[PDB]
Structures are given as structure tokens and as C-alpha cells.
Amino acid sequence: PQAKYRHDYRAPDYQITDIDLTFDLDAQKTVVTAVSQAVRHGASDAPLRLNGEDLKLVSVHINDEPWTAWKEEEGALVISNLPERFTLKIINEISPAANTALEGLYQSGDALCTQCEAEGFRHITYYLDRPDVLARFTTKIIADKIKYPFLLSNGNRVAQGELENGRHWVQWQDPFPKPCYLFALVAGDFDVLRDTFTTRSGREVALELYVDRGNLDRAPWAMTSLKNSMKWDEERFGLEYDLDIYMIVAVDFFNMGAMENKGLNIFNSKYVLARTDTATDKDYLDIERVIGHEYFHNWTGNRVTCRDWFQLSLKEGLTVFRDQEFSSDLGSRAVNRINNVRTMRGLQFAEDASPMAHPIRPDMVIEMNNFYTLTVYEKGAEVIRMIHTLLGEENFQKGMQLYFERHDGSAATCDDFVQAMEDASNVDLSHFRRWYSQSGTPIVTVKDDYNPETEQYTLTISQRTPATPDQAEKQPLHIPFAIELYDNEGKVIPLQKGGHPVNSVLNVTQAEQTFVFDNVYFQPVPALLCEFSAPVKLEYKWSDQQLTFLMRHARNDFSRWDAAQSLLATYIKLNVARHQQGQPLSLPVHVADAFRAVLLDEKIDPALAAEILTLPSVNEMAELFDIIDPIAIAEVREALTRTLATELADELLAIYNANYQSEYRVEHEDIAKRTLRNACLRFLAFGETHLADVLVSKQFHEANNMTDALAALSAAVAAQLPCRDALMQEYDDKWHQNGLVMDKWFILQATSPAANVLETVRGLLQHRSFTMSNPNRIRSLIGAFAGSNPAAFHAEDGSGYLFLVEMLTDLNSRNPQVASRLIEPLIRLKRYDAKRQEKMRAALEQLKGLENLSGDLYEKITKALA
Ligand SMILES: CN(C)c1ncnc2c1ncn2[C@@H]1O[C@H](CO)[C@@H](N)[C@H]1O
Ligand SMILES: COc1ccc(C[C@H](N)C(=O)O)cc1
Ligand SMILES: [Zn+2]
């Protein structure tokens, strides 16, 4: 498995301009005919090197001459002695039914569908499987009409026919040149929800959502959200859909979330199907965001694509930024920002502190499917957001416009995007570019001084990024550091110096620097790194009173939340140390009082209250520590919940009841109230047993929507309430035939605090609703155990590691992409104590020795074991 390097990019020796594909479809043996029009750009003696995996080659012709000057080698078909311009014809066979990896053309239930990103098209035919080769596709699909009445590919239908022996065919054409990773094919029997969207210039677009039979009842929200996505992109970005038909297919078997194939997106059904009894508010909002994300790729990914895979963030950072802006504009901006910061600080930072650390533009990859990461996506988006902070909306949109003017219809680079933004705005991003090439989380240290004689406030700000295993050399970044200063009534102090305004985004560009502010008439309380203005760790010696002051007075909702997180972090760290000494939780009265104040403040948005009242997750807590003690973290989190539950009991029940809603609506104010209600229920579940048991069981039985039902259920499991087992069996009895709904239940099982969780999980491998053939079930049971129950995963007996090794031993062979996601918790071994580290290393060494170890796993194991 050889590493590939960004610096080794070279333009292709050959282009393909046009490809005509024919599929004689059958689940056991599909025959692919591919007729490509090729053009040599490189040296006249260079062979054409086509990529292919697991293909049975039938024939090779060049201008209809059977060719003799070719050879197959590992991963490749190398064709020699070609003319400058020619027609290549390849016939080859593939076997969809054999494809358990779900890469290429595969079976999902009774349907046939494709996944081609990143390098899946080479599993279908021999091709230039690189995203800087852009070709015009025509696709003819021949199949059994009964089995496959719908035959879909990108674009519009150009031809159709019927054949003997019950076969029929449809031919599609997509006018826009594309890299092969955006090819899609779907064949099956579906229900179809059909609608229309008219663009702002009057183009009528046919919208078509394909779902398995009997799922139309779960389709309208996804269609609503597609329309909302299209409107928003018009309003915010000025972008309109460019084709006549927009197709989405929801499939049950899919490794990732969804896929932006031009005009024919393919979605995991998790990110499509919803009705009020099956889906929670968070499912609704995730469908919204994923529908949006894939639609936004139509411009940022498809009309402008990636020169090479190391440029992935060019489309993914920017399309995540767009999905976040879409959700934030339609819904609660602060709740969005809060949750994206929780992901950054709790999950992304862990990656950046791990053996798999990489810059948002990687330099070295073994298996590109391993680089669809929190870093490339979420840190990628933070980097785009920083450009937006530095430029402002108007200049950022001028940059977007210049980026599309220069690069529409091409495969571009991250550097191209940054150049466009610099050139449009006249903001210098030369130093800023280091964010693309440097891995790891910068640590930003802030000291302050108030001089009452001169009425000046001085911030001394330093930065450093620690080395990471991938990069021994680090340098200072251009860090946009947003501040606000508050007087003692809570009013903002104007920032100025020498008689002139100073921008509140400080440019922190050196290892150390000072910023001096004049006409500061009162000692201020600072709000620092406002709206998480750069993806960094902040070190400032906060008093508890400065933090509770911000919770009361800060102008932006995010700051109030962030101040609450800073206040809790001190006390989480205190109590983890106490747990290690066998001492009970300790929490100052004034800290509990600040959370009481949030409960009783009628002026606070409920959406923001709910988030302040949602404790940091065990992953966020782990981020606070150099060495992670997973059992201490889990138990401290429960104890902190119990303490607050006891101290705030009466207020929690008052706010619980005050936020009752008889009508269920998927509307943002209503969601906010429900999130606050259910935030209170999490604490009330740790009340006196009999009170809690009744409250939680009542909500479970009386709920008129799945948000409320699942909140109750999750509380019964988290607090090990007497009603737990009955409620859990009630749910299984009701919902066992519905795998998406059962995933919620598997997550609850896997994340249970019960002593016997591992035994329960292992027994659920045989559950009627579980199967190792379905990525969503694997994620919901096995993934949630390893990744989201770090306490049971890191059981001192080592049983959690042994369990994961067993499951990876299967998955390595079955589905290496899912295996690679699931090994992540073992690759974090150097964050744990020595005894755990030795057990985790033994597990990794077992896996390193597997027969037929996948490249996907090999990459991660060898970084981990270094
Ligand atoms: C589809 N959208 C909205 C995504 N938004 C954010 N990250 C994603 C997405 N799709 C895939 N990813 C990334 O790939 C990984 C799957 O766990 C996630 N890390 C995620 O950040
Ligand atoms: C291995 O299968 C896939 C790989 C990547 C994706 C992500 C999709 N482009 C997105 O950004 O949502 C989807 C599937
Ligand atoms: Zn994407």
C-alpha cells in the first residue's frame, strides 16, 4: 500500500473528453461497455495508464481495432503506442452482488446503485479515475423491466426502448463535463415523490425523490428541505440550479451520509426519511443540513471541482460552511454555532492531537477514503469562516463570484480559492494560507492589564502550535481574534486607540504581541475569541465572577454559552482529579447559582438556555485533559448532573412544565422550547427515584412525537430508572421492523451506564433488527459502544478492546471503509494511561497481523503503532 504525495501532482498525459457507457445490468454479472474519446497532452511516447479494480477485462479496441499493445498490472491497464486522438472501447464485467464494500456498483436491498467518490469508478470500468479529467457522459442502462423499472443516471433522458425477454433500457445525457467521481447509476423499483421548483430567473426544475416502496409517508420533509436549499442558495449566494431535473434516491445501504452526484444525488435513507413518530427534531434538522449540503455542492464541488484529492477541502470546507450558513439563516444561528463549536472542540481537536493528524489540505495519503475527516470538513469550514470574518460578507461574496468566474467548468485547487478571495477583496491572505498547510490546534494565551492612570487596557496575546506526529515544524498563523470589552453595567466599551476606532477582530499574526486600547474609562470584562473566531484553544485566567458576568450580560448568545463552558471546565477538571482520589463531587454554591439564574431568566432565548443547560459531552470533557481518564470523566458527568438535579430540582420542574407543548411542530421556536424542556428532563431523571420514574415514564407514554418519546427513553437509560427495561422492550416491540428507528435504541444500549453493557451489546449482535451487512446498524451498535461509551470501551479488564478487535476482524474483509471509522478509538492510545495503552497496542498489533489487511486499516494502524 504505497503513500501518495501532494507535491507529486502532475497534469495527466491523456484527457478523456466524452464517454458513452452501456450497462447490461444484472446483480450477479453486469457487463460494462465504455467508449471514450481521448486526447494526448503529454509526450508522444507516453502510454495511457487506466485505473481499474476487480474488473474482468473482455476486450480493448482503439478506433474499433482490437488492440494488442496493452498490459494489465496491479490496479491498472496500460495501453501503449497510441495516436494523439482516438476512440477507446473497453468491455468488462463486474459483480454487484459480491460487493460488500459498497464502493462502485453494488446492491442495496433489491436496488442497484453506485458510490464513486473518491475512487470507486475504477471498480466499474478502466478509466482515468482522477478528478482533473472532466468528460461528458452519456449512459445507457439495460435491465429486466420487472425487477428494475426505474433506470436512472445523471442528466436528462435522451433515448429509451424495450427489448425481448422482458428487458428495457433508458439512455441519459449530462451536458456538463464531470470527473468520474460524480457519475451515478441507480436501478430499482421505487415510490416517487414529484414536485417542482421554479428558479428566480424562471427555470422550472422537476424534483424527484425516489424511496423504497411504502416510504412516501416519510418523504415530504426532504422535498421541503430541497426547495428551501434551492431558495436559499439563490438569496444568499446568488446561485441557481443548472439542470432540468433534480433526482434524489434514498438507499438503506450506504457508508456515508449522502453524495452530490450531478443531478442524481444518492442519500443514506437516514438523511431523507422522517415523520413525526419516527424522527426527532435533530433528525429533521440533520435532513435539512444534508439535503442542503449535497445541493450546495452543485456549485462548490460540481461546477468547480477538485484538481486532485489533496484539494478535498476546497469543496468540503466551503460546502460545510454553506450548509452551516443555510441552517443558521433558517434556524437558530446561536444554536448552530454552539453545536459546531462543540464538534470542533470535542471531536476535531482530538483528531488534531492524534496519529492521524493532518492539515485541511493533506500532504500524504495512503487510502483517500480515510481523509473524509472532521479536519477536512469541520476545520475546513472554520478556515472558510475565518476568511469570511477577515473579509466581511460583501467582499466574501465578491470572492465567491470571482472564484466561479475564473474556475467554472474546471478542476481547481485550494490555492485558487484563496487567490480569488484575496484578489476580489484586496485583503492579503498570504500568511493566512498557512492554515491550509499546518496541522494541529493552536494554543492562544491571553494576559491582560488595566492602567487606571492612562485609562488603557492592554492585551498580551501569544500563540503556539505544538508539534504533531505528522509535522515537526510549526509556525505562527494569522489568527482572527475577535474581542468585546464590557463595562460594569454590561455595556460595550468602544475600541479605539490614538483617536481612531480599532477593529474588534484583532490580527494575531506573531508568536507574541500586544494590543493597546485607549479611552477605557473602567476596568473591562473581556469577551475573548467571540463566536469562536479562530479554531484555537484559549488560555486566559478567568475569574468565576468574570464568567458569570458574561453569562448575564454578553451581547452575543454564543458568548453567554461559551462563558458557561469556561466556568464548568474548571470544575470538571477539579472533580476528575477528585474522582481519581476517591473523593465526591465538589461544586461552589455560586456556580450552581449561575445555572439557576439561567433557568429563571425569562429574557433568555429558550434555545440558548437549553444549550447552557446541556453539559459538555464525555468527548468535550476529554479535550480538557492531557491524559484521558474515561471512567472518571463519565462518572463526574453523571455526578455533576445529579448535583445540579438536587440543587435546582424545583426550578427544573417549573421550567419543564412551563415549556409543555400540546401541538408538535417542526418549527424553530417550538424546537427551542422542546429542547429546553427535555434539557430539564435530563436533570429531573436524577431526582428522587420515585418522582423521576413517574415523570419519565409518563413522558414516554404520553408523547405525541419521537423527540419527546426518545428524550424520555434516553433519561430512563441514563439514570438507570426502574421503568427502563419495560420502556426499552416497549420500543423494540413497536419499532423492530424499522431499522432507522431501531438505530436510536441500539445507540441507547451501547451508551448505557449499566454494568453489564458489554454483555448486552454482544447479545445484540443477534438481535432481529441488527445486521453486520448494514453500515447504519454497525455504527449504531458497535460504533456507539467504541466511540461514545469510552467508559465501557476502556473498561480496565480490556474487554472493550477485545470486542472491537473481533468486529474489525470481520469488517476489515467485509467493509473496510466502515472498519476504518470504527478503529478510530484505538488509534488514540497515547492519550491513555500506560496500562490501557499496552492493551490497546496489543489489540492494534493483532489487527496489523490480519490476513488481507485492508489499506484503509493499514494506514491508521501503522500511524498508531509508531
Ligand atoms: C454531509 N455533511 C453535512 C457533512 N457535514 C459534516 N461532516 C461530514 C458530512 N458528510 C461527511 N462528513 C465528515 O465525514 C465524516 C463522517 O463521520 C464526519 N467526520 C464528518 O465530519
Ligand atoms: C465513500 O463514499 C462517500 C465518500 C464521500 C462522501 C461525501 C460526500 N461528498 C459529501 O461531502 O457529503 C459520500 C460517500
Ligand atoms: Zn460534501
Explain what you see.
Its EC number is 3.4.11.2. Its cofactor is Zn(2+). With 866 residues, the protein is of the alpha+beta class. Strands 6-5-9-3-2-12-15-14 form an eight-stranded mixed beta sheet, with no helix packed on it. It has a five-stranded mixed beta sheet with strand order 17-18-19-21-20, covered by helices on one side. Strands 10-11-16-13 form a four-stranded antiparallel beta sheet, with no helix packed on it. A hairpin with a 2-residue loop joins strand 5 and strand 6. The longest helix is centred in the middle third of the chain and has 24 residues, at 557-580. The relative contact order is 0.06. The structure holds ligand GMC, O-methyl-L-tyrosine (0A1) and zinc ion. Residues 256-258, 289-290, 293, 320, 323, 372-374, 377-378 line the site of the ligand CN(C)c1ncnc2c1ncn2[C@@H]1O[C@H](CO)[C@@H](N)[C@H]1O.
According to CATH, what is the class of the largest domain?
A: Mainly Alpha
CATH superfamily of the largest domain: Peptidase M1, alanyl aminopeptidase, C-terminal domain
Strand tally is 33
Residue share in helix: 40-55%
Count of DSSP H/I helices: 28
Tell me the radius of gyration.
28 Å
Q: How would a textbook summarize the main sheet? A: 8 strands, mixed
> What's the CATH topology label of the largest domain?
Zincin-like fold
State the end-to-end distance.
17 Å
Form type: globular
The CATH architecture of the largest domain can be given as Alpha Horseshoe
Function: Aminopeptidase N is involved in the degradation of intracellular peptides generated by protein breakdown during normal growth as well as in response to nutrient starvation.
Cofactor: Zn(2+)
Family: Belongs to the peptidase M1 family.
EC number: 3.4.11.2
